[PDB]
Ligand SMILES: O=C(O)c1[nH]c(=O)[nH]c(=O)c1F
Ligand SMILES: O=C(O)c1[nH]c(=O)[nH]c(=O)c1F
Ligand SMILES: [Zn+2]
Ligand SMILES: [Zn+2]
């Protein structure tokens with residue numbers, strides 16, 4: 071007996087096109103998405119060139135429209151130079167992403183005053199999300215209150231962070247957050263197995279106490295999002311390993327295993343992979359779209375999942391219960407039992423749908 | 433310049449058919465809904481006969497399918513005799529409604545043990561909502577924790593109640609709630625104008641401090657819902673006035689006025705009249721459905737709105753800014769500038785849509 075789920079949404083993926091297509095491209099990454107039961111993705115802007123101006127966004131839109139197999143929205147990225155320049159294209163993006171900790175030079179902000187400038191100039195009705203670790207969570211929350219608007223915290227990974235967000239919500243502050251599967255299912259205990267290269271990720275893997283705190287505070291977690299961050303094994307095992315894990319193909323099997331174990335309910339999962347992503351990012355419904363899963367099938371994650379060009383996974387060897395059997399996207403069979411059946415280019419930019427525009431006052 | 437909104441959802445209406453059709457019927461009440469920018473309603477079960485068994489639900493479904501002009505789901509009602517008997521029809525209903533304070537004999541529960549029995553036997557994946565005032569909020573929350581499931585509190589009307597819910601959410605308990613417009617825009621101060629008959633409503637009108645507490649704690653309010661409770665003027669002004677206000681045609685104009693005044697944002701409104709209703713009750717999207725509003729037009733609420741058979745309103749004389757200009761429902765023009773253009777029977781039972789079934793484990 072298969073269970074029908076709505077089309078799931080991952081609001082945090084890195085699809086590496088343009089400029090890193092040996093790691094992933096729209097076609098391979100959205101294949102990975104569909105195989106993971108994900109029918110809509112929001113793609114981060116730290117590509118090469120990064121999506122920090124209108125020409126780069128225009129290029130990325132065409133690459134995505136030609137390569138994506140599932141539907142998508144594209145983030146714009148904040149830079150030290152583009153505050154106040156994005157007004158005409160802001161509504162066409164998923165939102166604005168701030169890299170407030172480590173990143174490459176083009177996305178680095180050197181002063182909290184630059185964060186303030188972005189919060190002040192980005193249209194107030196559109197989403198802002200932040201990579202903000204440890205005290206940076208408190209700092210960006212302060213900037214949000216000074217400018218009287220909301221903020222969404224990406225990949226919350228620590229007891230410290232979820233408890234700060236919990237306190238902020240108790241005071242009625244408009245903050246939401248997401249958690250990635252590696253911060254719920256991996257910890258320091260796994261670093262010996264993974265090694266120092268494979269294990270590199272930002273936010274880093276937490277302690278067992280961090281993991282337990284995120285589970286205990288599930289009510290504070292608005293979304294799950296993979297932070298699909300593909301790099302090849304050569305790169306992860308080399309002399310300057312880049313941080314990040316691929317995760318699209320493993321995130322739903324891991325969470326379905328947790329559901330089967332009673333760690334959270336099926337509704338808890340669907341709030342965090344469907345309803346709350348929709349409502350935080352104003353993402354439109356997908357007509358005739360659904361995912362059929364088998365909650366009985368037991369399997370062991372292999373050394374690499376079939377589709378991501380990363381060709382490795384930190385979850386190798388984990389026993390899971392739950393698998394994606396079939397995905398229907400806008401009335402076409404998109405995935406069955408390991409076979410992707412929609413071509414590159416089938417996916418669409420949801421921000422161009424009339425129902426995908428963010429409502430605003432005139 | 434008109435603003436396009438998604439199709440709004442009111443999860444708490446009384447449409448009085450069967451058995452009170454001089455007060456309202458599916459056709460007139462859903463006309464009122466469309467004129468208020470509402471494209472989907474959840475209808476309460478305290479009709480005559482009340483919707484407390486499978487035959488009554490079957491009758492109500494046909495009456496709604498023949499009379500409704502917008503889409504709908506129908507609540508089942510808890511009784512002293514039907515716990516453990518609703519399993520085969522539960523998934524076809526909006527949810528289960530508990531009347532825990534005043535109601536008529538057929539829906540009265542005489543013991544908290546009967547509440548426990550309903551929480552124990554109603555399928556755990558389906559919604560339960562409660563009329564639960566003052567300490568009854570705490571009592572039903574206790575029953576929800578004893579049975580390890582969620583509950584939704586209807587029309588929260590008091591500082592006492594919203595602060596108790598706030599405390600429950602801070603402890604991570606699965607509770608949501610709704611607030612009706614009369615508890616945000618009317619108070620004790622209005623009882624002299626309204627008189628003792630018109631002013632009868634349950635929950636009663638609150639103090640200015642109650643109203644201010646609900647606004648201050650907007651972050652705790654998950655949904656707005658009208659509690660559209662129509663009775664004729666003759667009945668409201670008679671010797672045994674029934675409690676309740678009509679509200680479908682006034683609720684969005686009132687809240688749009690608040691948005692124009694800066695009391696809450698347009699997003700705050702759409703979370704509470706669209707996204708959160710969807711996700712709490714697992715209600716499906718409506719394809720090709722949207723509402724165009726004019727946020728500039730100033731007008732004064734008259735002595736009766738055009739469509740509700742109640743033919744009166746407690747908001748008479750309130751100055752509002754904001755009006756519904758056009759409603760499109762599933763690709764047909766449903767309402768323009770005071771004219772309803774879809775016939776009785778156009779509306780459908782969303783629980784019969786494949787996307788409208790509540791996901792559950794096998
Ligand atoms: O793009 C990446 O690889 C990446 N990887 C990470 O582990 N963290 C990031 O914040 C990031 F942008
Ligand atoms: O149906 C009604 O009129 C009604 N009216 C109210 O004012 N409160 C109720 O709880 C109710 F069921
Ligand atoms: Zn990041
Ligand atoms: Zn990332």
Ligand SMILES: [Zn+2]
Nearest residue numbers: 563586634635
């Ligand atoms: Zn009630």
Ligand SMILES: [Zn+2]
Nearest residue numbers: 446476659661
């Ligand atoms: Zn009611």
